[PDB]
Design a protein around this ligand. Structure first.
Ligand code: MG
Ligand code: ZN
Lengths: 53, 90, 35, 50, 53, 166, 293, 126, 261, 319
RNA sequence: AAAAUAAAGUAUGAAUUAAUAUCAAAAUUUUAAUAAAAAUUAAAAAAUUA
RNA sequence: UAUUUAAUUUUUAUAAUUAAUAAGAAAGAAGAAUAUAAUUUA
C-alpha cells in the first residue's frame, strides 16, 4: 500500500474507503479497488529498541 | 564462561533438588500406608481445526509405572509367526 | 573418537563363525535359483 | 471435512472475529424476561449477576 | 578519595535503612540539627555504637 | 529394597534403621564431592559439575541417598496429633539418641533438620519425664548426657534437659 | 511440507473443536463450564449456563449417530477410546537395537539379474546388560546391550567389576539405547537377529577409517538366524572386525517405519518359540529374505 | 573517561511537599523500639538520650523470635539464630574461630563405628 | 539438533525449531487463553475453555505430551431433560439444503418432551435465529396490524407516542412494501399507553414492548424478528407457509461494488 | 546456530509469533493498583458499609443499605427502583430473622406506597421478601391485592410464588398451578412442553436454595472481603476497553446514555447495528501505561468521628 | 593421484628476531590518518602439531 | 613467531538435563610383523 508521510496526507477516495487501525498505525482500507489502500508511515509492527530507535 | 552456561551450571543441580522436593510428596503418601501412582486426567479434546481449516491432532501419552515395573521384571510372550516369517513390505 | 565401543575390535574371535562355509552356502543358493 | 463440531451442520452422511458472545437458545434470547432472586437473574436456563 | 567516601556513605546509608530512612534524609537533617558528625564518624558510630547511631 | 518393594521393613525394627542411617553417615553420601577429592586444599567438584560437551557424564549427579534419606525422614515426619510416629515409641531411649545423632551426622552441615530434631527431642523428653520416677540407674544418666551433647552439637541446646542435669 | 499444520493454543476451545468440546469438573465431564459454588464470585456480564439447547442437541445427534453407524465412525472411536500402555503405540514407542560386527563382504542377486554388494554383520551374543533411568525423569530410559562373551581376563579390572555387579556374562562391548518404558526387556535377555525385520530400515553407527559415522536410511537385505548374520546392500568404509551399533530408523520424511500398511515389529524383542532348536536346523532353511526392491 | 562504579545511595520514598513545612523533619522513623529512646534537654542546647542497652534490645529480639516460632516449632535456622543471640548476650569476649570448628572436631560423638577401634572419652592403655 | 530420545511421530519438535532443549518450564508467554492466563477473567475464554485445559504458550505448543502415572478416563456426559425409553424423531440436515428453509435452524434430534403443546406443535422449536437489520415492515405471515392510540394522552417532544405514530407513518408511507389496506389505526378514549398489535395467520397476537425512550426503528426491528420466530412457531404446527417477496437476510446475494471508469 | 535461541526460520515466518496483545506476563505493577483505584474516583469504606467480595464485586451491606434508605427516602433523586433495590438488599436478614427484619420491609413498603401510589416494583419486592420469610398467606394476600388494584401480576410475581411455594415446604402442584396459571395469563412464555419446562424452573430453584438451607447458591456465606479489588484492570469483556472498573464520571455518562431516547441506535432488540470489534480498535500504549496512572488527590474523610470500639472486630454481616 | 625420499627420535647445536607486565581472545562506538588507544559489553584453560 | 582456527594429549563399560557450531595405572613393533591372536613344531 502507498505510504503517505503523515496522517494529514491521508484521504478517502471511494465511497467504500474506511479508516482502520493496524496496531497504532492509522490506515485506509478499500474492500473494492485495493489500489486505494494507504499506510501512514511509522514503525514496523514488531520492533525492538536497539533495532528500531 | 558465558552467561547462559554459568546460569545452567548453578541452576541444574537446583532443578534436580526442586524436583526431588516434588518427589518426596509421594514418599509421605507412601510411608503413611497408602500406595498410589498419582493419576493424570485423560484429556478428551485433542482434535482441532485451525484458522486455515485443516485437521490438527494432539498426541498425548501416559506412561504406567505398574506396567513398566512388570516389563522390566519378566519376559514378553512368544513372538507371533505373522511377524518374522513374512517380511515387511516397502 | 577414542571411546571403547569404537576402538575395540572383534577380529580375534572370527573363528567362532565360519565365514567361508556361509559364503559357499549362499553360492549354493546362488546356483539353486540360477543366478 | 475440515469443519469443526460447532458450525458443522450434521454428522450424518475464523481469523477475522476471534471471540464470540455465547448464544442463548433462539426463543429465549428474544426478549429475555427479567426475574430477580436476591440480586441474581434466574431463568429456566441461565443464571446471572445484575 | 571518591572511592573511599563512596564506601563510607554506602555504609551509613544502609545503617540508616535498617531504621527506615536513608542517606538522603539523614544528611539534610543532621545538618539542620547542627550535629556536625563527619560521615566517617557516623560510620564508626553505626558499626561500633549502634544504639548511639 | 527398603523403600520401593518392602516399605514396611524400616518402621518395624529401629535397630536396622539406625544401622543404615549410621553407615550412611559414615561414608558421607551427601558430599559426594569429597569422594573425588585427593587434597582438602583443592576440593573437587567432580560430582557437582557437568558440561554440555560431556565432561563428567559418569560422575555427574547421582541421586544416591536421596530416596532413602527422604523416605526415612518421612517416617519421622508424622507430626499429626491423631497418630504420633509409630516407630519412635518403639525405640529404646539410647536408640532415639543414636538415631538423632545419625540424622545429625548424615547432613553435610553436621546439623539435623528442624522437624526431625524437634520430633525426636520432644519424644525423648516425654520418655525421660515418665521414666525418672521409676527404676533408674547411673547408666541412664549417661544416655541423657550424651543426648544433651548431641543437642548442643545441633546448636539447639535443651534448656530443659540441661536444667535436669545441673 | 516438512512442517506440520500450525495451531496456536489461543485457538483451541469450544468453537474450534473437531469433536464436542468437554469441560472438566474433575469428578465429571460436562459440556458446560463449571459454575462456581460461591455465587458472589460470579462476574458481571457472565452467563452461568445450566442448560443450552444448541450445544446439547448437537452432542445428542453426535452420540446416537456414533452408535447407529459404528462402521462409518469407527475412527471417531479414537476420541472416546484411548489405547492402553504397552501394546506398541505406533507413534509413541521406540525399541533398542543391538550390537554387530562387520564380518565380511558378499555379492547377491535379486529376482532379476543385478549385482548387489552386501556387507555382512554378525551379532554373536546380544544380551541386555543394564537398565538405566536418570532420576526417574520421563523419556530418559536406556537399555544397555552387550556383545561377545569374553574370557575372565580380558578387560582392565574395573570393567570386569561392572559385569560382576550386573550378573550378566562378561561382554567385550556395550552400547546404550534410549527407549520408551514399554520397550523394556528384563536384564539378561538373549537377543536374536529376528528382532529386525528383513524389509525394514536401520540406523547404523560405527567407526570410520577415523571418527564415528551414522548411516540413517539403510534397508535390510537378508537374515541368517542360524549364524546370526544380517546383510546390507552397502559398502561401508570401515575395518573388518569393527563393532557397529544397530537401531531402527524411526521415520523417513513424515512416514513412520512401523504401521499397518508396512508392518509391525516384534515389539519389546523377538522371542523364540520354545519348540524350535537351532541345533537341528541347517543354514539354508534358516534364511529370511526381503521382498523385491 | 571511565564509567562510575562507586556504590550508590539507595532510592527513598517520595515526599509529598508537606516536607516543605518547618517543624516537620523529613526523616520519618517510627519503629518498634522507638518509644524506648527517651529525650532530655541539656543546658548546652545539646540533647540527652536514654535507651535500653545492647543485650536488652537483643533479648527483646529473642522474645519476639521465640514467640514467632512457638506455633509452628523452630526450624534449624531459627535454632541456630537463637543460639547465636543467646551467646552474643552473654559474650564477655570476642569470637575469633569458626563456629563449625568445634563440631567438626567433635563429630566422633555423633557417628559411632564398630567397637574394635571405637573411640571413647579417654583411650590409650584401655 | 535432536539428541536423546526422539519419538517416531514425524515432526513434533519442528515449530519451536527442531530441538527438545528446554521443556522444563511450567510457565510460558501467553496471549489471552494461553496457559497462565488460566486465572484471569475473559468473557470469551470463560465460557469457551475448561480451565484445566490451558496449555503452553506461543510457538512452543504441545503437539506431543508424555506424562507418567495412571490414566483417569471420566465417563462421557449424559444428556439432560430426557426421560429414558423415549423414542425420538430424527431430522436430516444437509448442506444440500439452503439457508432459506427453516429446516436448517432447529433441533437435529427431536423428542416429545421438547415439543410444546401450549401452541399446537407437532415438532419442537428452533434453537438458532438469523440476525439482520430490518429497514421496512413487510407483510410476512401477518394478516393484520393494529395500532391503538388515545389522543387524550398528550405531550410535546419525543415520546413513545411519537414513536408509535411514527411506526404508523412508516408503514403507510410510499416506500413501504407493507400493503396499506391491512394497517388499522384506532383512536381510543381512555388513557391507553399506545400499543402495536400484530395478528398472524394463526390467530395469535403479539405486542411489541414499547420501552421508555423507544424510537421508531426499534419497534420495526422487534416486530420483524418476532415475525420470524412466530413464522417458525406456526411452521411447527404444520401450517404451509408461502414464500416471501422480500428477503431481509440476503442469502443468495453477494456484496457488489460499482465500477471504476 | 543454537536453534534454541536463533531458530532456522524467516523473520517473515516468525513475526506472527511476536505477541502484540500480551496477556500473562502482566504489565501492571502492584504499586499502581492502589493509585489507579483513586484515579477512577472510588472510595475505601469501612467493612461495615460494604466491600469488594470474592468476585471483586462491590456489594453493600444490609443494615448499611437500610440506613442509606432511611436517610434518602424523601430525596428527589430517589426513585421507585431504589426502594426495591433496598428491599432486595434486606433478604438475608429477612430470612435469618423474619420477625424483626420484616418490619423494616414494611416501612419501605408503606413509605414507597405514599410517595408513588402503587407499583409492580414494590409488590414484587415485598412479596419476594415474604417468600424468603416463609409466610405463604402473606404472599397470596399480596397477589390478591395486586389483582384488586388492577396491577396485572408480572412473570416475576409467578416466579416469586413458585419460590414461596417451594421453600415454605408445601407440596408440588401448588407451584405447578402457579406456573400453569401464569402461563395461561400470558406472563410466562414456555418453550418445551409444560412438564419439562416446570422441571427446569424447579431445578433452577433448588440449585438456588435459600440462605438458611444446607445446599444452594444462597447457602454459601464465605465472602473474600477486601477494601479494594485485588486487581484494578480486571475485564468484564474481551479487550482492555471493556474493563470492569471504570471512572465514576464515565459510569455516569453511560447511565446518561441509557436513560436518554434511542434515536441513533437500536435497543430492546437483538441486532446491534454497531458490532463488538475490540481487536479493531487502537492497540498501543498511552503514556500512562509507562509512568503509571495519573495522580488525583486521594479520597479523604475530613472530621470523621473518633473510632471508638477500634479494638473490636466487626462481624461479617449476613445477620 | 600410485612408486622412490624426508618428519616422535639418542648426541651435537648455530642464525634472523627480542620495549615490556604471567597476557592481550570477541564485539560495538569514539578519538588529529590500520588504531593491539580509549570506553563499554563481554568470555579467552594447559600442552603438542599443522 | 604472537593471535586465530583444525587436530592430538596414546581403549572413555556408558555418552548428551544446558554452551558453541572428554578421558583408569603406559610406552619398544599398532604386527613378534610373510594379514590365522599360536596352523602340529627340537
Ligand atoms: Mg586524599
Ligand atoms: Zn477507495
Amino acid at each position: 500500500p502507498q505510504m503517505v508521510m503523515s496522517r494529514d496526507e491521508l484521504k478517502l477516495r471511494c465511497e467504500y474507503c474506511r479508516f482502520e487501525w493496524i496496531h497504532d498505525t492509522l490506515c485506509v482500507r478499500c474492500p473494492a479497488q485495493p489500489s486505494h489502500d494507504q499506510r501512514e508511515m511509522w514503525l514496523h509492527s514488531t520492533w525492538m529498541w536497539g533495532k528500531q530507535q | 564462561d558465558s552467561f547462559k552456561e554459568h546460569y545452567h551450571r548453578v541452576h541444574l543441580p537446583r532443578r534436580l533438588a526442586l524436583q526431588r522436593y516434588a518427589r518426596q510428596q509421594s514418599l509421605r503418601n507412601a510411608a503413611k500406608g497408602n500406595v498410589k501412582a498419582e493419576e493424570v486426567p485423560y484429556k478428551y479434546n485433542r482434535w482441532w481445526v485451525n484458522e486455515e481449516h485443516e485437521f490438527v491432532h494432539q498426541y498425548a501419552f501416559v506412561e504406567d509405572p505398574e506396567v513398566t515395573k512388570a516389563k522390566r521384571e519378566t519376559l514378553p510372550p512368544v513372538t507371533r509367526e505373522n511377524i518374522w516369517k513374512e517380511p515387511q513390505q516397502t | 573418537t577414542n571411546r571403547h565401543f569404537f576402538v575395540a575390535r572383534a577380529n580375534a574371535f572370527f573363528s567362532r563363525l565360519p565365514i567361508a562355509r556361509v559364503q559357499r552356502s549362499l553360492a549354493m543358493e546362488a546356483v539353486r535359483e540360477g543366478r | 471435512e475440515a469443519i469443526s463440531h460447532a458450525r458443522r451442520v450434521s454428522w450424518a452422511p475464523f481469523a477475522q472475529e476471534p471471540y464470540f458472545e455465547e448464544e442463548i437458545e433462539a426463543h429465549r434470547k428474544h426478549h429475555r424476561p427479567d426475574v430477580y432472586i436476591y440480586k441474581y437473574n434466574v431463568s429456566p436456563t441461565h443464571f446471572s449477576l445484575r | 578519595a571518591h572511592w573511599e567516601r563512596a564506601i563510607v556513605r554506602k555504609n551509613v546509608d544502609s545503617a540508616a535503612r535498617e531504621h527506615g530512612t536513608g542517606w538522603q534524609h539523614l544528611r539534610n537533617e543532621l545538618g539542620r540539627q547542627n550535629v556536625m558528625l563527619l560521615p566517617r564518624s557516623q560510620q564508626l558510630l553505626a558499626q561500633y555504637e549502634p544504639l548511639a547511631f | 529394597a527398603l523403600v520401593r518393594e518392602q516399605p514396611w521393613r524400616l518402621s518395624a525394627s529401629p535397630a536396622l534403621f539406625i544401622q543404615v542411617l549410621q553407615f550412611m553417615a559414615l561414608i558421607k553420601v551427601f558430599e559426594p564431592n569429597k569422594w573425588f577429592t585427593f587434597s582438602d586444599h583443592a576440593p573437587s567438584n567432580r560430582a557437582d559439575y557437568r558440561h554440555a560437551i560431556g565432561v563428567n557424564h559418569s560422575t555427574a549427579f547421582w541421586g544416591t541417598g536421596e530416596e532413602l534419606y527422604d523416605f526415612m525422614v518421612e517416617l519421622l515426619r508424622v507430626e499429626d496429633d491423631g497418630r504420633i510416629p509409630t516407630m519412635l515409641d518403639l525405640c529404646t531411649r539410647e536408640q532415639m539418641v543414636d538415631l538423632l545423632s545419625g540424622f545429625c551426622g548424615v547432613m553435610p552441615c553436621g546439623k539435623a533438620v528442624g522437624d526431625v530434631f524437634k520430633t525426636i527431642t520432644d519424644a525423648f523428653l516425654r520418655r525421660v519425664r515418665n521414666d525418672i520416677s521409676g527404676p533408674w540407674s547411673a547408666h541412664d544418666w549417661a544416655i541423657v548426657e550424651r543426648m544433651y551433647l548431641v543437642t548442643v552439637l545441633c546448636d539447639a541446646g535443651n534448656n530443659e534437659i540441661l536444667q535436669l542435669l545441673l | 511440507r516438512c512442517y506440520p499444520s500450525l495451531m496456536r493454543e489461543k485457538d483451541r476451545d469450544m468453537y474450534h473443536c473437531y469433536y464436542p468440546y468437554l469441560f472438566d469438573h474433575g469428578d465429571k465431564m460436562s459440556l458446560y463450564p463449571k459454575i462456581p459454588e460461591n455465587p458472589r464470585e460470579w462476574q458481571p456480564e457472565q452467563l452461568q449456563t445450566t442448560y443450552d439447547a444448541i450445544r446439547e442437541d448437537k452432542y445428542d445427534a453426535f452420540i446416537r449417530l456414533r452408535e447407529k453407524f459404528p462402521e462409518l465412525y469407527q475412527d471417531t472411536r479414537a476420541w472416546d477410546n484411548p489405547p492402553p500402555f504397552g501394546e506398541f503405540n505406533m507413534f509413541y514407542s521406540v525399541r533398542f537395537g543391538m550390537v554387530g560386527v562387520k564380518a565380511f563382504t558378499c555379492k547377491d542377486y535379486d529376482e532379476l539379474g543385478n549385482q548387489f554388494d552386501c556387507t555382512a554383520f554378525w551379532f554373536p551374543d546380544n544380551q541386555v546388560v543394564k537398565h538405566s533411568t536418570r532420576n526417574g525423569e520421563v523419556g530418559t530410559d536406556k537399555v544397555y546391550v552387550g556383545a561377545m562373551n569374553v574370557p575372565v581376563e580380558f578387560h582392565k579390572p574395573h570393567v570386569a567389576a561392572f559385569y560382576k555387579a550386573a550378573g550378566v556374562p562378561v561382554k567385550h562391548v556395550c552400547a546404550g539405547f534410549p527407549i520408551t518404558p514399554d520397550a523394556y526387556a528384563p536384564v539378561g535377555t538373549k537377543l536374536d537377529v529376528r528382532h529386525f525385520k528383513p524389509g525394514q530400515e536401520v540406523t547404523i553407527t560405527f567407526q570410520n577409517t577415523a571418527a564415528a559415522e551414522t548411516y540413517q536410511g539403510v534397508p535390510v537385505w537378508r537374515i541368517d538366524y542360524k549364524n546370526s548374520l544380517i546383510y546390507l546392500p552397502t559398502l561401508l568404509d570401515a575395518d573388518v572386525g569393527t563393532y557397529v551399533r544397530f537401531s531402527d530408523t524411526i521415520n523417513t520424511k513424515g512416514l513412520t517405519l512401523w504401521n499397518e500398511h508396512r508392518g509391525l515389529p516384534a515389539f519389546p524383542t523377538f522371542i523364540p518359540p520354545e519348540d524350535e532348536d537351532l541345533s537341528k536346523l541347517a543354514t539354508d532353511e534358516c534364511q529370511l529374505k526381503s521382498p523385491p526392491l | 573517561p571511565k564509567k562510575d562504579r562507586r556504590f550508590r545511595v539507595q532510592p527513598l520514598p517520595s515526599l509529598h511537599a508537606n516536607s516543605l513545612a518547618d517543624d516537620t523533619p523529613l526523616v520519618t522513623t517510627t519503629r518498634t523500639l522507638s518509644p524506648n529512646f527517651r529525650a532530655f534537654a541539656l543546658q548546652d542546647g545539646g540533647v540527652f538520650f536514654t535507651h535500653p542497652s545492647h543485650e536488652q534490645v537483643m533479648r527483646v529480639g529473642q522474645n519476639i523470635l521465640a514467640e514467632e516460632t512457638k506455633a509452628t516449632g523452630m526450624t534449624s535456622m531459627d535454632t541456630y539464630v537463637n543460639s547465636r543471640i543467646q551467646s552474643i548476650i552473654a559474650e564477655n569476649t570476642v569470637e575469633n574461630v569458626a563456629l563449625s570448628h568445634w563440631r567438626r572436631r567433635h563429630m566422633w560423638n555423633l557417628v559411632r563405628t564398630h567397637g574394635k577401634l571405637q573411640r571413647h572419652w579417654g583411650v590409650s592403655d584401655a | 539438533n535432536l539428541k536423546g530420545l526422539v519419538y517416531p511421530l514425524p515432526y513434533y519438535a519442528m515449530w519451536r525449531g527442531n530441538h527438545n532443549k528446554y521443556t522444563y518450564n511450567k510457565s510460558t508467554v501467553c496471549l489471552w487463553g494461553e496457559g497462565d492466563t488460566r486465572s484471569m477473567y475473559h468473557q470469551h475464554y470463560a465460557h469457551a475453555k475448561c480451565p484445566t485445559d490451558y496449555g503452553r504458550g506461543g510457538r512452543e505448543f504441545e503437539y506431543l505430551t508424555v506424562k507418567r502415572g495412571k490414566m483417569l478416563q471420566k465417563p462421557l456426559p449424559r444428556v439432560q431433560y430426557v426421560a429414558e425409553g423415549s423414542k425420538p424423531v430424527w431430522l436430516f440436515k444437509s448442506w444440500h439444503t439452503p439457508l432459506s428453509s427453516p429446516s436448517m435452524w432447529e433441533r437435529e434430534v427431536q423428542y416429545a418432551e421438547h415439543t410444546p403443546e401450549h401452541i399446537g406443535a407437532k415438532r419442537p422449536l428452533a434453537v438458532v435465529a438469523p440476525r439482520t437489520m430490518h429497514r421496512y415492515l413487510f407483510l410476512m405471515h401477518m394478516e393484520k396490524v393494529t395500532i391503538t392510540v388515545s389522543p387524550l394522552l398528550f405531550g410535546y417532544g419525543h415520546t413513545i407516542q411519537k414513536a408509535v405514530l411514527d411506526f404508523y407513518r412508516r408503514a403507510i408511507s410510499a416506500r413501504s412494501p407493507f400493503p396499506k389496506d391491512k394497517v388499522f389505526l384506532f383512536y381510543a378514549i381512555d388513557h391507553i399507553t399506545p400499543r402495536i398489535e400484530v395478528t398472524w395467520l394463526d390467530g395469535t397476537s403479539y405486542v411489541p414492548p414499547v420501552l421508555e425512550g423507544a424510537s421508531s426503528q426499534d419497534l420495526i426491528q422487534m416486530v420483524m424478528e418476532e415475525a420470524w420466530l412466530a413464522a417458525d412457531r406456526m411452521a411447527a404446527e404444520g401450517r404451509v407457509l408461502n414464500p416471501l417477496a422480500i428477503d431481509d437476510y440476503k442469502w443468495d446475494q453477494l456484496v457488489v461494488f460499482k465500477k471504476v471508469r | 546456530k543454537n536453534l534454541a535461541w536463533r531458530p532456522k526460520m524467516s523473520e517473515r515466518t516468525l513475526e506472527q509469533f511476536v505477541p502484540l496483545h500480551l496477556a500473562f506476563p502482566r504489565r501492571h505493577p502492584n504499586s499502581w493498583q492502589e493509585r489507579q483505584f483513586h484515579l477512577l474516583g472510588y472510595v475505601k469504606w469501612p467493612k461495615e458499609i460494604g466491600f469488594y467480595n470474592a468476585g471483586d464485586n462491590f456489594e453493600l451491606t444490609p443494615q448499611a443499605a437500610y440506613r442509606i434508605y432511611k436517610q434518602n427516602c424523601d430525596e428527589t433523586f430517589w426513585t421507585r427502583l431504589h426502594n426495591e433495590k433496598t428491599i432486595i438488599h434486606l433478604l438475608p436478614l429477612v430470612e435469618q430473622d423474619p420477625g424483626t427484619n420484616m418490619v423494616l420491609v414494611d416501612d419501605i413498603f408503606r413509605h414507597h406506597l405514599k410517595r408513588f401510589g402503587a407499583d409492580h416494583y414494590i409488590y414484587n419486592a415485598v412479596m419476594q421478601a415474604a417468600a424468603f420469610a416463609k409466610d405463604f398467606p402473606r404472599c397470596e394476600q399480596l397477589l390478591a391485592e395486586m389483582r384488586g388494584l388492577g396491577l396485572e401480576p408480572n412473570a416475576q410475581s409467578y416466579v416469586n410464588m413458585m419460590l414461596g411455594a417451594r421453600l415454605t415446604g408445601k407440596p408440588r402442584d401448588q407451584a405447578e398451578a402457579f406456573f400453569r396459571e401464569g402461563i395461561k395469563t400470558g406472563a410466562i412464555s414456555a418453550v418445551m412442553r409444560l412438564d419439562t419446562e416446570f422441571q427446569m424452573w424447579m431445578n433452577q430453584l433448588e440449585r438456588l436454595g435459600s440462605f438458611k438451607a444446607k445446599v444452594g447458591y444462597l447457602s454459601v456465606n464465605e465472602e473474600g472481603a477486601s477494601p479494594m479489588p485485588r486487581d484494578m484492570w480486571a475485564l468484564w469483556g474481551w479487550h482492555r476497553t471493556e474493563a470492569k472498573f471504570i471512572s465514576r464520571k464515565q459510569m455516569i455518562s453511560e447511565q446518561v446514555q441509557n436513560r436518554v431516547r434511542s434515536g441513533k441506535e437500536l435497543v430492546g432488540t437483538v441486532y446491534q447495528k454497531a458490532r463488538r470489534q475490540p481487536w479493531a480498535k487502537y492497540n498501543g500504549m498511552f503514556p500512562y501505561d509507562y509512568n503509571g496512572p495519573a495522580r488525583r488527590p486521594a479520597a479523604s474523610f475530613v472530621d470523621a468521628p473518633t473510632p471508638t470500639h477500634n479494638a473490636e472486630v466487626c462481624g461479617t454481616a449476613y445477620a
